[PDB]
Short mmCIF file of C-alpha atoms in Angstrom, two decimals:
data_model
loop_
_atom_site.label_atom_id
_atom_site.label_comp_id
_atom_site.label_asym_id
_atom_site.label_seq_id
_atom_site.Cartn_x
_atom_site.Cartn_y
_atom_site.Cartn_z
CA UNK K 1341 5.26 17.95 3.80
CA UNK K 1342 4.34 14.43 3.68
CA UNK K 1343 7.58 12.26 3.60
CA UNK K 1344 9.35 15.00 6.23
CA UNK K 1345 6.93 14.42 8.61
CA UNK K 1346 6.66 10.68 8.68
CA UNK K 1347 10.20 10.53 8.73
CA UNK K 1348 10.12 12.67 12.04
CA UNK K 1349 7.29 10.90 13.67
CA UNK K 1350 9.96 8.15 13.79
CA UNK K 1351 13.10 9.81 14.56
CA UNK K 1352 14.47 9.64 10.80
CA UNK K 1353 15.65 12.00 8.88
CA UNK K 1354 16.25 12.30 5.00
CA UNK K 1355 19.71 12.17 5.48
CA UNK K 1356 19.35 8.72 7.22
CA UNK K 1357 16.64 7.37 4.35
CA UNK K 1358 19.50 8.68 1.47
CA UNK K 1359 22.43 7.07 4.12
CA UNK K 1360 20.38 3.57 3.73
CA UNK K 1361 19.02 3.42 -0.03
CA UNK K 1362 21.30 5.31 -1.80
CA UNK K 1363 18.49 8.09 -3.07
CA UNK K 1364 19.85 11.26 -3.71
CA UNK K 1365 19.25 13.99 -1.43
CA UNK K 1366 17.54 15.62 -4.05
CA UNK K 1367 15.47 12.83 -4.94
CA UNK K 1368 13.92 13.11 -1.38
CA UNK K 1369 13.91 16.55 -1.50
CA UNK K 1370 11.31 16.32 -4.88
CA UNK K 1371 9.46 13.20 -3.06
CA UNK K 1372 8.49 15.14 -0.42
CA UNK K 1373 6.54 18.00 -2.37
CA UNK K 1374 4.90 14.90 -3.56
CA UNK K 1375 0.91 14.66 -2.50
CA UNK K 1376 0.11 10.74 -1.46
CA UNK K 1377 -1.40 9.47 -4.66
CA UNK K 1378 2.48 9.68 -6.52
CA UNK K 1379 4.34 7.76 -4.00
CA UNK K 1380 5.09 4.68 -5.39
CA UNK K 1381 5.30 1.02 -3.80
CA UNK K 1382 9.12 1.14 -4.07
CA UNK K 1383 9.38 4.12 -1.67
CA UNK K 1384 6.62 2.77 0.55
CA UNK K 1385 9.11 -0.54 0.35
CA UNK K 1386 12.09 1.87 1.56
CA UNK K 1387 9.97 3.41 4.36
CA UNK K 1388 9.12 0.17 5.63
CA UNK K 1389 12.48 -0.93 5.71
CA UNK K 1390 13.87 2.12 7.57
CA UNK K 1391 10.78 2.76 10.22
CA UNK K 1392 10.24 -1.41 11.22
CA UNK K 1393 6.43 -0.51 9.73
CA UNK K 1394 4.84 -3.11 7.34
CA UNK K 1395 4.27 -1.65 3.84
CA UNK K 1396 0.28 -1.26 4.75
CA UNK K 1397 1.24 -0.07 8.11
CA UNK K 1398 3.44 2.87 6.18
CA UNK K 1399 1.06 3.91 3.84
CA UNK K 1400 -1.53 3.80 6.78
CA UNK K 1401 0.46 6.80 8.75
CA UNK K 1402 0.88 8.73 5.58
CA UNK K 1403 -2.72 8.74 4.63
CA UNK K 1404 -3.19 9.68 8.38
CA UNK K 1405 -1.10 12.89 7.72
CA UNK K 1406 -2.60 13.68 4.67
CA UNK K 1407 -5.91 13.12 6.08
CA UNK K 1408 -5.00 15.71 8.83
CA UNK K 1409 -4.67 18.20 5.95
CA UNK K 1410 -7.84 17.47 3.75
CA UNK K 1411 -10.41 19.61 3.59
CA UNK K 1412 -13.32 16.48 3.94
CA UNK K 1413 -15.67 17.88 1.38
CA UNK K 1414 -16.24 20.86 4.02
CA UNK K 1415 -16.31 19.00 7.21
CA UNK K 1416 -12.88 19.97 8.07
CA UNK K 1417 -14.07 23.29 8.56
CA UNK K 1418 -17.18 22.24 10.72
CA UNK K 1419 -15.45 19.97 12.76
CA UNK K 1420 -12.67 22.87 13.99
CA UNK K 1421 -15.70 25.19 14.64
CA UNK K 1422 -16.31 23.32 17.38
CA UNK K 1423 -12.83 21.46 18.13
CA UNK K 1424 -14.48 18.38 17.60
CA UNK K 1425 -13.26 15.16 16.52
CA UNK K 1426 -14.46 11.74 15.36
CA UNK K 1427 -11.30 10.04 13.92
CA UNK K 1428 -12.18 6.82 13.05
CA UNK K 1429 -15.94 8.46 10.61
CA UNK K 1430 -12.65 11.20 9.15
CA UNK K 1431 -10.94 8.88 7.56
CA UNK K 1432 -13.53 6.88 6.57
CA UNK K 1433 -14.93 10.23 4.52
CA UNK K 1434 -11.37 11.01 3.68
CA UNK K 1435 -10.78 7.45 2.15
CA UNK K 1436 -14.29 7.26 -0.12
CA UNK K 1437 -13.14 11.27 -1.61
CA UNK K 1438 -9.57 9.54 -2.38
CA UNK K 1439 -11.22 6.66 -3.93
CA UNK K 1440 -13.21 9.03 -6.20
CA UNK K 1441 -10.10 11.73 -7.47
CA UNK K 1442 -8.49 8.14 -8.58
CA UNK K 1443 -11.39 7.78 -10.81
CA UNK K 1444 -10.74 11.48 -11.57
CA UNK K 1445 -14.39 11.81 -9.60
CA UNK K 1446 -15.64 15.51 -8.70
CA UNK K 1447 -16.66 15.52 -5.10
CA UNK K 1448 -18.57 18.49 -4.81
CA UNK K 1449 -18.35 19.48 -1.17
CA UNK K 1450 -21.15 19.39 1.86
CA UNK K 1451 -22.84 22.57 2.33
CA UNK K 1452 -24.03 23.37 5.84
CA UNK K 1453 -26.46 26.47 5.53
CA UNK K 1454 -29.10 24.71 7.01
CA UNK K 1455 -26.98 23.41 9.66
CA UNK K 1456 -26.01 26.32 11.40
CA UNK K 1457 -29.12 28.31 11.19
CA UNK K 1458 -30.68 25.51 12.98
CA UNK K 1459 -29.76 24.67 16.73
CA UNK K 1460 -28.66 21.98 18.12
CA UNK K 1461 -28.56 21.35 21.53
CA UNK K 1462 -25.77 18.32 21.65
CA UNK K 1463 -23.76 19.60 18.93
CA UNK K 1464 -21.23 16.77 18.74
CA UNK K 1465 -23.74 14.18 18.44
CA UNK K 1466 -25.35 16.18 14.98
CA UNK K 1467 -22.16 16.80 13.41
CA UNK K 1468 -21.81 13.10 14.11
CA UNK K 1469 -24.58 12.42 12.02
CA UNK K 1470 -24.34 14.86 9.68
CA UNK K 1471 -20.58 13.55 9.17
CA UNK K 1472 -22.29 9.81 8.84
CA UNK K 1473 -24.87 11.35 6.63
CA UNK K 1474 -22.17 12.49 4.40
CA UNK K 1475 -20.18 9.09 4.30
CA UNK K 1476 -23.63 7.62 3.34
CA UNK K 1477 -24.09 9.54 0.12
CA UNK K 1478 -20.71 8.69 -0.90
CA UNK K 1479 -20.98 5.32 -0.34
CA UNK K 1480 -24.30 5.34 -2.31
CA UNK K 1481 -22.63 7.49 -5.30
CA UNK K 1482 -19.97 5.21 -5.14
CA UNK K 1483 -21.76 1.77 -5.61
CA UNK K 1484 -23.68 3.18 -8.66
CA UNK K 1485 -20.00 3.56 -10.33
CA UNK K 1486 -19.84 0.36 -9.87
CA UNK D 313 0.90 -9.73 -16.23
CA UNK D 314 0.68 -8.89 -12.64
CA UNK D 315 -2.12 -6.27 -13.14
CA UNK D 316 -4.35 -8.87 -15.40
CA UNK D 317 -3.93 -11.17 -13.08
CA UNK D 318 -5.38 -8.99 -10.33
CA UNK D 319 -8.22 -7.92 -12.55
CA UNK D 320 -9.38 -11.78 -13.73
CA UNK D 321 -9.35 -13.00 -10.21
CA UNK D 322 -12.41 -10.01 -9.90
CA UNK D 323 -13.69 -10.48 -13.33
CA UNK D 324 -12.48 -7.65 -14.45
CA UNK D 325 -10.80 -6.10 -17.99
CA UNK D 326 -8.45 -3.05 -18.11
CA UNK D 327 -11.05 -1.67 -20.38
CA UNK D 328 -13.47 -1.53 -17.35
CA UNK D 329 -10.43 0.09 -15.51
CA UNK D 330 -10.09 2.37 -17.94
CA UNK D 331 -13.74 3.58 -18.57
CA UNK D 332 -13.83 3.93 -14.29
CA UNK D 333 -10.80 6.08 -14.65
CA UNK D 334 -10.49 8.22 -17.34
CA UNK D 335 -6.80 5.98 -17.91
CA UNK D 336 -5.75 5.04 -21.44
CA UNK D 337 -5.64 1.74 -22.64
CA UNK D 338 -2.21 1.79 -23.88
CA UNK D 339 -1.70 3.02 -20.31
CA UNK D 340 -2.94 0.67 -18.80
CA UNK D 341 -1.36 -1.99 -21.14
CA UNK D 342 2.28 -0.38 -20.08
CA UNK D 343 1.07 -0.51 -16.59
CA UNK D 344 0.62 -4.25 -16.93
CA UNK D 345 3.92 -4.79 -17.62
CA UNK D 346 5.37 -2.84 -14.43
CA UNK D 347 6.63 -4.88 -11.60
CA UNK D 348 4.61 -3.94 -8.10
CA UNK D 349 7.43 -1.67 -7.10
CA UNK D 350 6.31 0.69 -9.70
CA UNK D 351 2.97 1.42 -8.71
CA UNK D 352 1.48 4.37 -7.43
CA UNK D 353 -0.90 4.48 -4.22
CA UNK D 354 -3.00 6.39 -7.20
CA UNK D 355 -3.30 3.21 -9.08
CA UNK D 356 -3.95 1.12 -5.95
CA UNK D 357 -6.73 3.84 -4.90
CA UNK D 358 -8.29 2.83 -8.26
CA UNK D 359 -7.68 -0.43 -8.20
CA UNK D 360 -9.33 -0.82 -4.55
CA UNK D 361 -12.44 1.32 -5.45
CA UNK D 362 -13.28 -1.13 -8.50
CA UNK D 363 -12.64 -4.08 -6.58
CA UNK D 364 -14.24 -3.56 -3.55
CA UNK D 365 -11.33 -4.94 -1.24
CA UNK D 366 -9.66 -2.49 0.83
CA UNK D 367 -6.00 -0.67 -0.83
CA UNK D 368 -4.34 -3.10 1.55
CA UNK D 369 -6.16 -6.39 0.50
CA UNK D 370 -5.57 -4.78 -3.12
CA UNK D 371 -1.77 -4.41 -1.87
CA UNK D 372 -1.05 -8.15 -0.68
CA UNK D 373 -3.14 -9.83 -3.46
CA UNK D 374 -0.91 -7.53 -5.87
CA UNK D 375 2.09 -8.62 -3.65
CA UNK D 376 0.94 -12.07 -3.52
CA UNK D 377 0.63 -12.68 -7.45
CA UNK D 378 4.51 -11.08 -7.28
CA UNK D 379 5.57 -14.06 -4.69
CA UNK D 380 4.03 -16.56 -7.39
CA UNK D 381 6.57 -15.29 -9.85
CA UNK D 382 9.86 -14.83 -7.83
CA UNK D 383 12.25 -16.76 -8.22
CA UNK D 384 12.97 -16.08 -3.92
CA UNK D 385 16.69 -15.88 -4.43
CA UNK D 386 16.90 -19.69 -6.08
CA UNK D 387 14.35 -20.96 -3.74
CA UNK D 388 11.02 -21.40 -6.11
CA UNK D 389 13.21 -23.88 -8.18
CA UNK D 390 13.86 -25.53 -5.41
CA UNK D 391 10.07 -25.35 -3.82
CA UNK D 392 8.69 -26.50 -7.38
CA UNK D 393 11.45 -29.26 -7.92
CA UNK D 394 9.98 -30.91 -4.67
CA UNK D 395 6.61 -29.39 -5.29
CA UNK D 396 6.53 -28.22 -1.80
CA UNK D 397 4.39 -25.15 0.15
CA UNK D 398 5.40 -22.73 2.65
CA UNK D 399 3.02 -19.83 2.46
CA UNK D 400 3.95 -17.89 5.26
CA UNK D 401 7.86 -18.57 4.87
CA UNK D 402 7.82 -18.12 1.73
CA UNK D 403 5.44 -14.48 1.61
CA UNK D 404 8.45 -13.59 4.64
CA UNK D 405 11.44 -14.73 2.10
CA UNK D 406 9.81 -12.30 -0.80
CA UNK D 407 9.13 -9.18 1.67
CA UNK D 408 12.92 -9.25 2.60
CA UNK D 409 13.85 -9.69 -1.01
CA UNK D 410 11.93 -6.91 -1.69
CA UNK D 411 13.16 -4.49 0.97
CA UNK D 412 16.21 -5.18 -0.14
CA UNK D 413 15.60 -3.82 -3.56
CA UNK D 414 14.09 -1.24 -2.15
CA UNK D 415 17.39 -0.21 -0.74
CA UNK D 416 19.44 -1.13 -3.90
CA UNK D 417 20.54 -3.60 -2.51
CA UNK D 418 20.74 -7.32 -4.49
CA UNK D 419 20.07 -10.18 -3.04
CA UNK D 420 22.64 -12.87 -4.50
CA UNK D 421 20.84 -16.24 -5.14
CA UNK D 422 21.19 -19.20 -2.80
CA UNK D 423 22.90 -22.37 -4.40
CA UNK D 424 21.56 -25.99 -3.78
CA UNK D 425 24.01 -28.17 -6.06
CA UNK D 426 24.97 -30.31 -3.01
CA UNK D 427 21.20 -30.50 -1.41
CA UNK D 428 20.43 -31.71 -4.99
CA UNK D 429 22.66 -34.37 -5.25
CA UNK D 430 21.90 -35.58 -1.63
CA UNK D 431 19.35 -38.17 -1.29
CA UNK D 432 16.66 -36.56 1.33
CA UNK D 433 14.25 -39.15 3.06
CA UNK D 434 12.80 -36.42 4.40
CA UNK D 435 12.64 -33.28 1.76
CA UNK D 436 9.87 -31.50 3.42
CA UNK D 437 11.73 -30.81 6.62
CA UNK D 438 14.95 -30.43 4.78
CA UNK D 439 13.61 -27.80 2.49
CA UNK D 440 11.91 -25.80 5.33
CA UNK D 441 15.06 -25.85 7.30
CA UNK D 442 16.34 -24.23 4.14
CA UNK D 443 14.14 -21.88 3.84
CA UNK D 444 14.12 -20.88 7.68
CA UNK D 445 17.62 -20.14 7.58
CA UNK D 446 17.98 -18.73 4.64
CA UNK D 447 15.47 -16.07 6.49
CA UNK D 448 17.55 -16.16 9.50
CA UNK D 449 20.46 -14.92 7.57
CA UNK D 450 18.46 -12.30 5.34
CA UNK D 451 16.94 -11.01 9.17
CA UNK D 452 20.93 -10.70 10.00
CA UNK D 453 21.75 -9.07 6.94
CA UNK D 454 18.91 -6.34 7.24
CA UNK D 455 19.82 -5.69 10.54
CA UNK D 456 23.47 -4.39 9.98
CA UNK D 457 22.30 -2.11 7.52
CA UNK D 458 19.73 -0.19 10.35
#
């Protein structure tokens, strides 16, 4: 739950975010089976307010937790395989498969059978670059939208 | 129109938008009409991938257009009487406006009939002063409701 767990990451609760704006308990209740891409500026606007963030700053954290929930195409499931973790090339990957659903965009996810047949004797540094890799074709597919 | 607005500084239409996305026309046409508060991080998402600026740069040129057109509780009458600038001041003077809105909360106009009828050698200074304290207070005023 997206809004819940901002809200605790700061020491908030909803009853706190209704106390201030006046939104119904309900309201927040509804917001917060909400995924990212239906929150609207206003609420962004009431989060910023509440937590001290900047708008951007808000919506930065969110999109963190969501991230932390998105399957990457497939690379989610890689990268816990070996509990590795390259945070900055995630949401990178997670940002470009956003970008496409908001063009109602298919990403068809990475496929790894070749991967792990093959060895790999520094496995962090090839999931690196098979994570890069990835980022690469969508940046590609992405500028021939455009 | 705060979306066309966004769009020609790009060169772009809604009809490009539209053909990206999958979104209506007439959608898009009601969208235009939609103060920033109503926005959704979806339409931002899109907005951002046709662009090529980041959702945030999309965010504060979207917020930016906004300042253009407030009327900053009484205080773009009073910029544009003197035909003054205060970029920074003034971007501050909208953000609280807007968190305030964001909290139901209105924001009653500040009055200038006496600074009006005041000669003012010095209208630059006298009008940032203004405007500084008129942030001052708003800071105050969002403070007692944390």
């Amino acid at each position: 739950k997206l809004l819940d767990e901002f809200l605790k990451k700061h020491d908030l609760t909803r009853y706190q975010l209704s106390k201030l704006t006046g939104i119904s308990q309900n309201t927040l209740k509804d917001q917060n089976e909400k995924p990212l891409n239906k929150y609207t500026v206003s609420i962004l606007r009431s989060l910023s307010l509440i937590s001290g963030l900047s708008v951007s700053d808000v919506l930065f954290e969110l999109e963190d937790i969501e991230k932390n929930s998105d399957d990457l195409a497939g690379f989610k499931h890689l990268l816990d395989k070996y509990k590795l973790s390259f945070p900055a090339q995630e949401f990178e990957l997670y940002c470009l498969i956003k970008e496409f659903e908001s063009a109602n965009i298919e990403v068809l996810p990475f496929t790894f059978n070749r991967f792990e047949n093959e060895e790999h004797v520094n496995i962090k540094k090839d999931v690196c670059k098979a994570l890069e890799n990835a980022i690469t074709v969508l940046k590609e597919k992405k500028n021939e939208l455009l």
